[PDB]
Amino acid sequence: LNSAPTPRDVVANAPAPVQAAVAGAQEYAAQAGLNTEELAVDALYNAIKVRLAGGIPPQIEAFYQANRTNFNGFYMANRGAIDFIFS
Hints:
Residues 1-83 form the Resuscitation-promoting factor Rpf1 C-terminal domain. By secondary structure, this protein is mainly alpha-helical. It is 71% helix and 0% strand. The chain has a single domain (1-87), classed as Non-ribosomal Peptide Synthetase Peptidyl Carrier Protein, Chain A (Orthogonal Bundle), CATH 1.10.1200. The chain starts with 6 loop residues before the first helix and ends with a helix.
C-alpha cells in the first residue's frame, strides 16, 4: 500500500517515546515480513503499559482489542490517553 500513511506518519506529532516504539516496530516488520500495523499497535500498547507500570485502564485495553490491526484507529482511539500518560 505504498501511498498510504505508515504508522510513523500517523504519529508524526506524537510524543517522542510513541515515535520510538512505532519506528522500531515498522523497521522490524519490514525486515521480518510481519504485518506493520499489527506490530506497531502491539509496540505502542506495550509502551503505554511500560509508562504506566512506572495497572492498565480498562478503556485502553478495550481500544487495543477493538483495533488490533488498525493502527490509525488504535492511535486515534487512545490519543487522549497517550497525551496524558506521556505529557
